[PDB]
């Protein structure tokens, strides 16, 4: 996985340290990348998780 600045993710555990911004998928070799199977798939789950974290009853 490639970040926005071009950093290659050697270990995914670094995702726990902070939120990482990835590069845009493209076909040209200058910025060649491809969206993963989980990319743009659980946005509703992310919103629900954020709502749960900000609840005032749990």
């Amino acid at each position: 996985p490639k970040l926005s600045n071009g950093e290659l993710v050697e270990n995914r555990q670094i995702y726990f340290n902070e939120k990482l911004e990835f590069t845009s998928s493209n076909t040209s070799k200058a910025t060649k990348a491809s969206n993963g199977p989980f990319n743009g798939e659980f946005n509703r789950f992310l919103s629900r998780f954020e709502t749960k974290l900000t609840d005032k009853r749990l």
Partner: protein
């Protein structure tokens, strides 16, 4: 004697509370601030707590 009561109408509280001078302690617990850890849950419990049945990519 050891009894646990899962009451939901809270009717029995007055039935198990006498004067404090009789040395009859009670363990009336308020689950609003019972501090249940969320790291004691298993697969199904966690996925029910966070994920909902609306998503089809569970």
């Amino acid at each position: 004697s050891h009894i646990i009561i899962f009451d939901i109408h809270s009717e029995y509280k007055s039935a198990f509370e006498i004067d404090k001078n009789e040395d009859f302690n009670l363990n009336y617990l308020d689950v609003e601030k019972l501090k249940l850890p969320y790291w004691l849950m298993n697969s199904e419990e966690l996925e029910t707590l966070f994920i909902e049945s609306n998503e089809q990519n569970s």
